[PDB]
Design a binder for these strands. Structure first.
Lengths: 205, 157, 81, 76, 129, 31, 215
RNA sequence: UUGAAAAAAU
RNA sequence: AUUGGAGGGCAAGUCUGGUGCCAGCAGCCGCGGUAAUUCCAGCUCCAAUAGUGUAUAUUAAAGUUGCUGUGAUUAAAACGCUCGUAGUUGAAUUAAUUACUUUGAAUAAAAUAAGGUGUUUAAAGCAAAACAUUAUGUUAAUGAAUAUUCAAGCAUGGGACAAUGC
RNA sequence: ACGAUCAGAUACCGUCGUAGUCCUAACUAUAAACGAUGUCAACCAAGGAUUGGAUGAAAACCUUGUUCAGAACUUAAAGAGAAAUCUUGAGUUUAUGGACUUCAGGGGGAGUAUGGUCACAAGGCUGAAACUUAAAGGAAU
């Protein structure tokens, strides 16, 4: 049907997410992220539902895969925080999606006269709190956005939010690693029954 | 009130005395019909506005209303003999779509032109005002005669 | 024809989309086969501009995605209407 | 809210979903009218007017409801 | 105090629809409010509703589907003669093809198009686009 | 609230939290 | 010529035919040359030529602000504003903004569906600042009953019958036209009864030809 | 700590 | 064929002589202190037309008197605050009057809207004529049903929304 | 009342000082008496904190969850407005009607004149007109 049986998260993927404490979030909880939160931890911190993390993860990858399966350059992956610069750069390498590495110059989606003016159809941001500028420019160009939101961030101008830890070095690299692998699986360029050659340590900062 | 014989106004002046967009449009017709002054344009405009008000009021009622059937046909009947409204248009909606050229094109000065008696529309006035023209059995010298459909083929010297 | 066009209808609020609305989006979710590879067929979701700027687009879509079957248990039972 | 002060208390008894004198108590007016010794108490001389205006409303209603006799009238 | 229960309910429904809510709740439910919704339901402006009994003039839950623009009550219900209809339609309704008035006549709570058909007048309750 | 929930069928836990008169059908907290 | 936008590229090679194909999907018009391609023969109107001033140490720095209204009489119109040091440049600058600010105008009938469309479909109100303009549908014969300032704009939009009621400081013309354009601008956002139907499945032009413009 | 005032129209 | 006007409001002169903040023009902004587009003139042309300005008053404009329909933090404008009679407004619920609503009855004309009618058309009038090519007949010709008309009053169909006590 | 400063100082500056400042009794009834925001009722985004109860856990005071009432605060890409700004409304308003009360109609003349009334008095309350003039004013650059 719509979520076939080949799409359960294999035990390898769950094993690494708990290892990289992806489920571990912040303390202040946004109201819009209460559904993904399963329970509060021992020192009053949010613990994301791992299944809810994966189901949104694949759904985001499916949307990217469809758009990027004919026009790879029409996807832009912005990543403000210095931690997520390497992982955002490898995501560009293995899918062809453009990826703004460091600071996002305001008006790079609205000013056509600019030399570095790109007009995408999908935007992926590493952190809505750091990359609020990129999200706000979407509301001028009718472009849907996807964010690796955390339990405290504001879900303004984000359509698909992946509940995961976007501050730790391991989780930042791991989630981008899963998104790239899932995208390739949907593309058909990577069999679902094999193991991806590139290890997570490549994405790590 | 003091007098017993009724009186009425045939025209109204425009609300805005000075418009350039109106001086050209009104002078377009004066040349096209050789009218004496701007009173004729207002009179024709006043005449049309009365019929448009009957249809406008009557379109707000039901089709089975007794007044709609009776008064509605009466207005269409009256227009049909005058010939302002084409016969094939027999609904009250088409009354609202009438213009100010329909009424002015049935005037005697217009009719004698297109029938060919008068070379120029300024020349038609002298022939009309001189009683040279005749309508059926009666001599006419008022250039404003709104001829009917029956009297259309009965215009001779 | 009388209409200039037939305006889109937002999938979230079931309300029209303005021609000047520059915050509205259009999310396409391609269908996947039994192997797990996308297909050229897709379903289109439209979200109005004002919905996005509130923090509601993400939760509202999950109601629609779960109803259409692209998600299984993201949204709880008592939150589906 | 309250009849005289701007307070808004919503505390209420809650009868379940299963079906299986006050005027006298407001004569409080006697107790304050204490006023004979504390002549300068401009507060209790105001809260008495509020109490007495309440009595003139319960009497005005118990007469219409034909509960109190038609000759009733509260006085010192 | 709550002078008009109908006014409170309609203003609650209008506010919810502006926010795009999926359903609304009306605390005091009367027969007049229930009958006012049937006029809106017969025109498919609202999906349905559920009168939940609480032994205290129980609440109502109303399902809305992205169609209602504004439903408003009219303060004291003016006696509307049948000749005074199009005067009221030309004021309260956006166009001759869209709006709908509501009148409480002796033949129940009808709209304008079926009170005219039934050939009756009455006090005017409100309207809804 | 902004995250809309079902009103006709409140959750078992939610009606325990709310005020006794603010439940869907007001019931006391006594016995 | 030589556009710098994805949509602008599609228009030049004749892939997007109708202007309303842009309006359905909310694609912003970022080049005025696009409008001149899909909307030939746009009639021209200049509303006012007002001069603003800025006090400086040396004196006053005067600039001329020009309002121009553009649009063909088939339900499309736009209003643009530009201030510059020269009158010729001000009208040319406002020309571009007017074309970029094109907006479809929804018009219907008064009481009977006898072609063709003449008047607004419902009651619309546009809110500039203190000036508020309200448009009421009118029968066939009635012209544009409005002040000289919005009547010039309403002629361009192709609305022949309308009833207008104005509130506010109408003697300031900048807000008067903006409030008129704001009334028409939202004519397509009012979901009437006849627009309930969802409609068929369509495809954005920027998605249909996404692969084509990639090279 | 002391520092008041600057005709009318352009 | 005149009246008023030619800076803007508002259609019409980057025409020539004097005056030099004077005479003056000017409904409002304003023009005139020596190069006046406004003064007093000459020519030119703009509007209306047997009409055209002025002064006063009524209506619209005026959503600047608000029922439809206003405003009250700062522009004018929430009583210093509480109690309170008259007045106005009052939760859900029921399978004798009044009010409300629908039909009539009755109801001076003129006037209003209006039906017909070629006073040469029109205002008008309720006259007349298609026609018998006319005494004859159409003809015992038309007369608007002319609709109304608010506040009361009479009767009747209905009882949802309201009012008055048992 | 003196002494300074000053052109002058009857003022600010310094020193002395009557009524007054305090209490009791009787008056007076006005304030930039202000939130310049009438009273009552319904709906209404996100968040932290606080005063007083109730209710679970945590061994009266503190820490945490729910809920009721009160004085407040922060964010808005939304709603309103002329804007400043408001959001426990100044929102739900040309898409105009929840109930009720008071007040305003260009600026002066003017809270003035006269009439009435209250007070021992100062004064308060109710309160015009003739005439004069194209502005007076609000928020922001």
């Amino acid at each position: 049907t719509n979520f076939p049986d080949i799409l359960k998260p294999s035990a390898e993927d769950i094993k690494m997410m708990v290892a990289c404490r992806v489920h571990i979030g912040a303390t202040n909880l946004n109201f819009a992220m209460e559904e993904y939160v399963y329970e509060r931890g021992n020192n009053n911190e949010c613990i994301f539902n791992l299944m809810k993390t994966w189901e949104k993860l694949s759904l985001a990858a499916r949307v990217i895969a469809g758009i990027s399966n004919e026009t790879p350059s029409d996807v832009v992956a912005v990543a403000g925080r210095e931690m997520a610069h390497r992982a955002s750069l490898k995501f560009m390498k293995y899918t062809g999606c453009t990826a703004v590495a460091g600071r996002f110059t305001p008006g790079s989606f609205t000013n056509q006269i600019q030399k570095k003016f790109m007009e995408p159809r999908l935007i992926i941001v590493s952190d809505p709190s750091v990359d609020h500028q990129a999200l706000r420019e979407s509301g001028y160009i009718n472009v849907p956005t996807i964010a690796f939101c955390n339990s405290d961030n504001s879900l303004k101008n984000v359509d698909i939010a992946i509940p995961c830890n976007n501050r730790s070095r391991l989780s930042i690299g791991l989630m981008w690693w899963m998104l790239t692998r899932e995208i390739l699986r949907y593309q058909g360029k990577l069999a679902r029954d094999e193991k991806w050659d590139v290890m997570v340590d490549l994405f790590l900062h | 009130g003091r007098c017993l014989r009724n009186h009425s106004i045939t025209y109204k002046t425009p609300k805005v005395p000075y418009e350039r967009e109106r001086f050209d449009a009104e002078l377009k017709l004066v040349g096209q019909f050789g009218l004496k002054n701007k009173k004729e344009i207002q009179r024709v405009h006043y005449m049309l506005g009365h019929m448009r008000t009957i249809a406008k009021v009557m379109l707000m009622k039901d089709a089975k209303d007794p007044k709609r059937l009776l008064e509605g046909a009466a207005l269409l009947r009256r227009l049909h003999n005058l010939g302002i409204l084409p016969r094939d248009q027999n609904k009250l909606e088409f009354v609202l779509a009438l213009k100010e050229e329909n009424l002015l094109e049935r005037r005697l000065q217009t009719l004698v032109y297109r029938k060919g008696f008068a070379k120029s529309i300024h020349h038609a006035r002298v022939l009309i005002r001189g009683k040279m023209i005749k309508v059926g059995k009666q001599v006419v010298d008022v250039p404003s005669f709104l001829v009917r459909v029956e009297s259309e083929p009965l215009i001779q010297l | 024809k009388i209409e200039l066009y037939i305006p889109r209808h937002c999938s979230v609020t079931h309300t029209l989309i303005a021609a000047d609305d520059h915050a509205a989006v259009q999310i396409l979710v391609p269908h996947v086969n039994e192997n797990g590879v996308i297909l050229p067929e897709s379903t289109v979701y439209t979200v109005k501009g004002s919905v996005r700027k509130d923090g509601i687009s993400d939760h509202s879509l999950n109601r629609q995605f779960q109803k259409d079957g692209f998600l299984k248990t993201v949204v709880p039972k008592n939150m589906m209407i | 809210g309250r009849m005289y002060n701007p307070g808004r208390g919503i505390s209420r008894r809650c009868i379940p979903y299963r079906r299986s004198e006050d005027l006298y108590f407001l004569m409080r007016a006697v107790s304050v009218r204490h006023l004979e010794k504390n002549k300068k108490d401009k507060d209790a001389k105001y809260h008495l007017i509020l109490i007495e205006s309440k009595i003139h409303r319960l009497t005005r209603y118990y007469k219409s409801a034909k509960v109190l006799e038609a000759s009733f009238k509260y006085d010192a | 105090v709550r002078v008009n229960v109908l006014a409170d309910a309609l203003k609650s429904i209008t506010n919810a629809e502006k926010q795009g809510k999926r359903q609304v709740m009306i605390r005091p439910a009367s027969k007049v409010i229930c009958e006012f919704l049937n006029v809106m339901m017969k025109h498919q402006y609202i999906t349905d509703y559920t009168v939940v009994d609480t032994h205290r003039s129980g609440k109502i839950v109303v399902n809305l589907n992205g169609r209602l623009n504004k439903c408003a009550v009219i303060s004291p219900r003016f006696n509307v003669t049948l000749s005074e209809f199009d005067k009221w339609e030309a004021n309260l309704l956006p166009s001759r093809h869209f709006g709908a008035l509501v009148l409480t006549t002796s033949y129940g709570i009808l709209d304008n198009t079926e009170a005219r058909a039934k050939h009756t007048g009455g006090r005017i309750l409100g309207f809804f686009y | 609230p902004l995250i809309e929930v079902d009103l006709l069928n409140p959750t078992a836990a939610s009606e325990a939290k709310a005020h006794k008169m603010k439940r869907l059908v007001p019931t006391p907290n006594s016995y | 010529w030589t556009p710098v936008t994805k949509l602008g590229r599609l228009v030049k090679d004749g892939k997007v035919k109708s202007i309303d194909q842009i309006f359905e999907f909310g694609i912003k018009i970022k080049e005025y040359q696009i409008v001149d391609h899909l909307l030939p023969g746009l009639k021209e109107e200049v509303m006012t030529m007002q001069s603003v001033q800025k006090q400086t140490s040396a004196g006053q720095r005067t600039r001329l602000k020009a309002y121009v209204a553009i649009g063909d009489h088939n339900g499309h119109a736009g209003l643009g504003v530009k201030c510059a040091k020269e009158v010729a440049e001000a009208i040319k600058g406002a020309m571009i903004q007017a074309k970029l600010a094109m907006v479809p105008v929804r018009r219907g009938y008064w009481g009977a569906t006898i072609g063709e469309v003449h008047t607004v479909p419902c009651k619309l109100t546009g809110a500039c600042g203190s000036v508020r303009v309200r448009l009421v549908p009118a029968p066939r014969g009635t012209g544009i009953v409005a002040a000289p300032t919005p009547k010039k704009f309403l002629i361009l939009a192709g609305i022949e019958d309308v009833f207008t009621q104005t509130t506010g400081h109408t003697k300031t013309l900048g807000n008067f036209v903006k409030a008129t354009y704001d009334a028409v601008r939202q004519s397509y956002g009012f979901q009437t009864k006849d627009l309930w139907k969802v409609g068929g499945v369509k495809q954005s032009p920027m998605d249909k030809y996404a692969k084509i413009l990639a090279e």
